[PDB]
Amino acid sequence: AMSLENVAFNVVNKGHFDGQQGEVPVSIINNTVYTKVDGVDVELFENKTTLPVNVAFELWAKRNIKPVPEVKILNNLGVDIAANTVIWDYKRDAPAHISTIGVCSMTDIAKKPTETICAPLTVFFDGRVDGQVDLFRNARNGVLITEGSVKGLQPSVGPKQASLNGVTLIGEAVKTQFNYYKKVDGVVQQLPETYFTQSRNLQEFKPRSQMEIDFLELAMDEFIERYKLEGYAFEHIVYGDFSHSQLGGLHLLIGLAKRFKESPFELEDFIPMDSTVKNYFITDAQTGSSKCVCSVIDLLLDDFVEIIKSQDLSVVSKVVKVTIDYTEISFMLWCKDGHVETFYPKL
Amino acid sequence: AMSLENVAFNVVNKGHFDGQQGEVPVSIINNTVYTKVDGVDVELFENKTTLPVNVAFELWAKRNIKPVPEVKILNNLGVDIAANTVIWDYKRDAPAHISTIGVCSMTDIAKKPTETICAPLTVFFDGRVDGQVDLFRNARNGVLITEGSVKGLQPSVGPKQASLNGVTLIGEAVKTQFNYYKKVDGVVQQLPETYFTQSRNLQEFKPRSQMEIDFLELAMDEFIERYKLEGYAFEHIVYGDFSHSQLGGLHLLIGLAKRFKESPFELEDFIPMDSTVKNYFITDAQTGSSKCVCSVIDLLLDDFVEIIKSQDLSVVSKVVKVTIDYTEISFMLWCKDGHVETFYPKL
Amino acid sequence: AMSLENVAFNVVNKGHFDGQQGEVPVSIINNTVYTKVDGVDVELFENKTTLPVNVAFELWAKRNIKPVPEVKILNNLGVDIAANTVIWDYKRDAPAHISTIGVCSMTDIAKKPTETICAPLTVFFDGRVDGQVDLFRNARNGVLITEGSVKGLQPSVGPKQASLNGVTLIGEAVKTQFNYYKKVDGVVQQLPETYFTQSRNLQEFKPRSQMEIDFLELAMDEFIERYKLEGYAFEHIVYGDFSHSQLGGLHLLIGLAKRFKESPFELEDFIPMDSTVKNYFITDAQTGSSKCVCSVIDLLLDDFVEIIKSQDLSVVSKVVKVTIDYTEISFMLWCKDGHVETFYPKL
Amino acid sequence: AMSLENVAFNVVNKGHFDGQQGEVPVSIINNTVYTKVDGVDVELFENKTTLPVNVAFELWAKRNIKPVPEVKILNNLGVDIAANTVIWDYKRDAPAHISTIGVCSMTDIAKKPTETICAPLTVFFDGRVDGQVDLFRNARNGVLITEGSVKGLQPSVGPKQASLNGVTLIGEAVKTQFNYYKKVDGVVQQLPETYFTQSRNLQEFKPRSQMEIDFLELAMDEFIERYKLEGYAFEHIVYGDFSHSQLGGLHLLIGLAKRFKESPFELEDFIPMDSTVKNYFITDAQTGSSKCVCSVIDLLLDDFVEIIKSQDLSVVSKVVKVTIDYTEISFMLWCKDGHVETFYPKL
Amino acid sequence: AMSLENVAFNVVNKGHFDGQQGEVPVSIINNTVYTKVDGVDVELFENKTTLPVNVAFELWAKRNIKPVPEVKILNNLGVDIAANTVIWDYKRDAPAHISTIGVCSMTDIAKKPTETICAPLTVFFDGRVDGQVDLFRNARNGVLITEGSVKGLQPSVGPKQASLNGVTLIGEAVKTQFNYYKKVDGVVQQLPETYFTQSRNLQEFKPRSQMEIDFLELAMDEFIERYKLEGYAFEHIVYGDFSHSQLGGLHLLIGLAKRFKESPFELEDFIPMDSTVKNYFITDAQTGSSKCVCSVIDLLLDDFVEIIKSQDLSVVSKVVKVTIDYTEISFMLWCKDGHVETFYPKL
């Protein structure tokens, strides 16, 4: 039987819900869950979601603590709901999906993914859990992830990294590379060929290729000449211009990291969530240059160089469609006199 | 096995906690408890107390639903806590006592009344529950109530009425008259002789003696002459004076009912709780006469007549101590030329 | 000197702030003020305003408890603020004015009415308080009320009733009729000749003239013939039409009381506030006839008859402006073939 | 056409209110504004102010995003309100002024600065906006800032730095130095000659002169001898004494940074707001030396040296008035035997 | 005398309550205390406790600002309440004890420690306050701390560090080493011989012995070969195993700091409170190794090697009881073939 006190007992004894028996005193005040330890109140959970505090507490205690795809990947694949698990969104401090299957009586729309209400929805299946591969095989719309290969389905190799308790990492002791499968209306889809965002963070940016190491260590002109990027506007697209009141270019995360190690500045993440492309209110503290909305994507610099070289520079103004993170991303390309003026992700 | 969902299931199915097994979905939002009935949220409880909402909900679901002494009686007896039950205060919309014994893990200071922490406290025992008379016999400080007589203890006959689910009544199908026993520091006390307030309500006042029937039906002068109350200031201290801006007298509830029948007015209960003496902000809508602090006691008119006749009229000013509801009530008496000027309960 | 605990002590001991010394323990949880009486929490005040809970509690404890003009009268006279007092609006359950003078440190814009910030504001002065008449004489914009006459100023006789602790009444033991004075930009104004709303309530409606007694007792036709109202659409304006799905007429409170005494119905006061003209969502429970916006004014039936008999009765459609409660009220008049079609207050 | 949904649309698409057309779904729960992005709720704004959540959200979305004077400068100049803009106070996380002009219908006291209610207030005008210089010329009380020079008024050169989106910076790509003008009762004032606070923070302290570089790098005695500050108590005033339980001196921010480089410590900003002089509860983690109220000012070390050399050493104890940030700052000076004992800003 | 406004005045002018006279305007909105400074609201306190906001604000303003034992020491010693002071728990952001003596009228159970209600409780006495040593001498259950020696009682030397305004430090300018005394039921106890935890922090870890310096600087194998720790499983117990999905060992804080220097990781403090043994949800960002519950204790490395060498290495499995911080800590010891398998604090 599911009880708030049992959930709190599991949290205080194991850090998350593990299906153990036991109760613990609980107080609920002002969107916060408290438990009494030695006659003194200790906070267990602060509700940051729009759900009721007890419902959110139960959903958070039942979050998946194995490595899972970043919620941006699930969004791009159209996942509506997860089967028998909770994907916690650590960017929003909330559950990734509004409804559940077989998790919480206050949010379940079904107990099993095989029920009728779930058929039109794209269900997330985890092949690491026994029986979920067969559930996906019988399901109408859904997305499957496995560590290895499943019989009779062609895998799509996903990102190297995954999310584990809200920290994104490429696994060494754990497998974070999954094979992705998708079915729409009963027919197994063939996922497109895509680039993947590196999901790196600005403050602890770490290079993942020799080219990124050079970009961080070298100066502008040396890097531009070493990789033959003379006609590709890297000094504006990637390095960023800080000479005018309006900030120029600066659409790759690695350029932001370069500037940050050079001189710190602050990003206003005015839509805090997980996306392939993020928009920031960027103020440069050294110069005062600023831009209200600056679209930033964190690609591997090698991949972005490949994309920028694979473009036709004869056009003046066009929209480039790049498949990144299993989704189509629109880039505006401006070329003049055989060289590009800007190349930024569209809004 | 104690759980919020189980408490809510008991409330939904039986109206109060009965110790049945089962669970229902619960939502807690803004000091309110909701449950899902056929996909929509139905409010079960609104926390009016200073306790956390879930704690207050559990305490309210476990209130005693048998006839119990009014909380004013328990207060006058010095009851600190009830043994293995919750006395709900329906005037404050809150539990009558701040701690419990063997009721709620968030508010219990002990599981049994025999614990050491309970020894200095005056515990309330209910002789209608098996084993409580022996618990009282072994207890150090406590108050016992029984339907009948217990061997070796002299009863104190209590009020005729009791409280049942928040409505005060003199029982016909149920017994509402109790025998009261009290122990202080291990020695059985002798409760004093007292009058009891009638706990009547202004809006639905009903007479309970022939004299009260006469008081309601007759006019002033004929009632005064029929009971020889000529020298006892009844026309001021009972009927009320409405000729000046400051309201005069009007200290008996029956006088309030008399005035209310002919002309309704406004009572502001600025300290809403249960007391032998109540203080009201009274404004008379017919005349505009008003008084900020009008102390009101609801005695049987016969008892008040007995009290007023048993007074010494030779004094000019003195404080009269009357035992009402097992407590000492101070009355201010003003006598002039051998007749009463005022007789009102002190503050 | 001013403290929340002292305010609570005054409320507990006197029902309102009286400037007595003493403190009492206070708790503030969820827009509610609690005090501890015998180890138990008793609610003193629930904040229904948009102010902070402690500020609202202090303002409510310092409300005027003498008879005062109704809030609608002060609004029509342009009163912005009261001098050294709080006018509590019992319709809104909030202070009538947003700033104070010499009342609350969290709300005062000045300590005295004579300061410069108060000069452009219309201040309310109470001649029953010593010195306020001279303050008004020196003030630039203000409104003065007195019981009697002041030297050198021509009174405007106000309504018969006033408000005392939130109950409207014509005073007998206390004087509720005031003389009104108004100064604009330093020059004493001449208040217009006006009608006054009776401020009566629907459920407990009392006639104030023989004509209203006849209206309540007689049937329609006898009343119409007795007062020669044959060409004045009293069938529609006053009595109300309940034959169509859309409710007809019914713009006088006495008509609503007439309908209510025989068949109760539902009023939705969707703008709960004090005004000369009230708008209600009327649903007639007997017939189902309903109207979303039904403007209602509570005039004395004699005065409304006088108004309706002073109309031209020849033009087809016009707006007639009547001075009621010191303000101009627009009525739409429809006349056809020399008789009134409808006559309702404009929105 | 002002609307909460339109404000949220502007925030979602541009990070601030820009006047674009569009709507997004909005939820308001518990002083937080949420919008729905792809079926999940994303928090846009958390209300930290005393205003209603929607009002605060609208005011925050309409904050000035160009460089503006720091809030303390405006406070020292007596600015009551800004004309047609919102100055956001990022220290308090709230609007800098309580009323607006032509910004929000819930907080506006006027639509244009030329209205009568604004005349007694000191309005803030921004010369970078067309028409505001003329508005200031016509205004009775106001403060004007311009990038350049206005015809017929003598500028007062302001601080080098300004605030831009809540980060203080000396602008390179944008101009952050303003000319200040002030009118009182219609007459153009002559602003005093003042020092300016450097508005630096502890963690990222940077020198702004060769003397500060020496102070950060040199040892105590080396610096004292190099700049001949032998009789000026720098070892107590600036460096700070950490030998007793009560912390000694340490009234300049550069000294705090000097100590912080060696051993970090705790600053408790118990009045979090912007002011020329800040009071901190300082506990030194290395030694345990602490002081409850440590007044700190961030002057350029050169300017403070000039101030302390400009003093008269013969007096024993006097109050020194220094004009800093357009306001008078009282310093307490103690001298003994012709040398300074202590020199701290008064409380 | 005790007022919320006076408490706020003391906080504004002194940073804490000092018993100065004065009042300041206060607003209370949503568990936050605001004061008005120059017409704008500045937040003074945000309530993080389960108490009412004003009660918590008063308790926080009256916290002890002198060095005090860490609340874990008081908990292990059984302290129920402090005498005439408030111990603030900065881990919980709440008062360390639920009741007070002579502090706050809303939370006091007595005014003096000598009253009867306090007799069965273990009261905390501070010998640095005059009269408290005598109060402890007369008390029945209590704990005493003094800087020096008291006549006729054998001291127990406490930890080197204490807490000062929420920061733990070994005092140089102030004494943080206390002598501890304890009485149970009137008889002076003899405290056991104990180890003490170092209370150090992960991110700013500092070695406090030559052995810890070597542990931080050396490599694993070099350190093990020194100090002769070959048969004591330090590789697992102290350094931590990061090769499997489940994190191995890592039960000493110094090992956490060692790993953190080379590669930062995530600690989830799911029970945030002060304790001798802490449980963390640790996920290693470099490898992905993680463990839901990691018992961590911050002992001096010398003390820990002494404990582990003091063990009987012939048993296969047993529970070792170590007295740390005046409490018994159970360690599970696993040994095979005469060498340790693992040695972790029991959970």
Numbering used by the authors:
A (entry chain E), B (entry chain B), C (entry chain F), D (entry chain D), E (entry chain A): -1 to 345
Excerpt from the publication:
The NSP15 endoribonuclease enzyme, known as NendoU, is highly conserved and plays a critical role in the ability of the virus to evade the immune system. NendoU is a three-domain 34 kDa protein that was demonstrated to form a barrel-shaped hexamer in solution by the assembly of two trimers. The oligomerization is mostly driven by the contacts of the N-terminal (ND) and the middle (MD) domains, while the C-terminal domain (CD) carries the canonical catalytic residues from the endonuclease family. In terms of substrate specificity, NendoU of the coronaviruses is described to cleave a great variety of single- and double-stranded RNAs in an Mn2+-dependent reaction, by hydrolyzing the 3′ end of pyrimidines, with a strong preference for uracil, and to release 2′,3′-cyclic phosphate and 5′-hydroxyl ends as products.
During our cryo-EM studies, we were able to elucidate multiple high-quality models of NendoUhex in different pHs and buffers, with resolution ranging from 2.5 to 3.5 Å. Based on our biochemical results, we performed cryo-EM data collection of NendoUhex in buffers where the enzyme showed maximum activity and reduced activity, such as PBS at pH 6.0, Bis-Tris at pH 6.0 (two more active conditions) and HEPES at pH 7.5 (a less active condition), detailed in Supplementary Table S1. In PBS with 150 mM NaCl, NendoUhex activity was also significantly higher at pH 6.0 (v0 = 430.4 ± 15.0 RFU/min) than at pH 7.4 (v0 = 74.2 ± 3.0 RFU/min). Despite their similarities, models showed consistent differences in the switch region. However, in cryo-EM models obtained in PBS at pH 6.0 and Bis-Tris at pH 6.0, we saw a less mobile and more open conformation of switch regions, much more like known crystal structures. In fact, this open–closed form model seems to agree with our biochemical data showing that the enzyme is far more active in acidic than in basic pH, where the switch seems to be found in the closed conformation. A general observation we made was that particles from samples in basic pHs, such as HEPES at pH 7.5, tend to be individual particles, while particles from samples obtained in more acid pHs, such as Bis-Tris at pH 6.0 and PBS at pH 6.0, tend to be arranged side by side, forming filaments, which is a common mechanism of allosteric control of enzyme activity. However, the most drastic similar effect was obtained when we added the DNA oligo(dT)30 to the samples in Bis-Tris at pH 6.0 and in PBS at pH 6.0, where we saw the immediate formation of 2D crystals of NendoU in the frozen grid, which somehow had induced the same pattern of arrangement of particle in all directions.
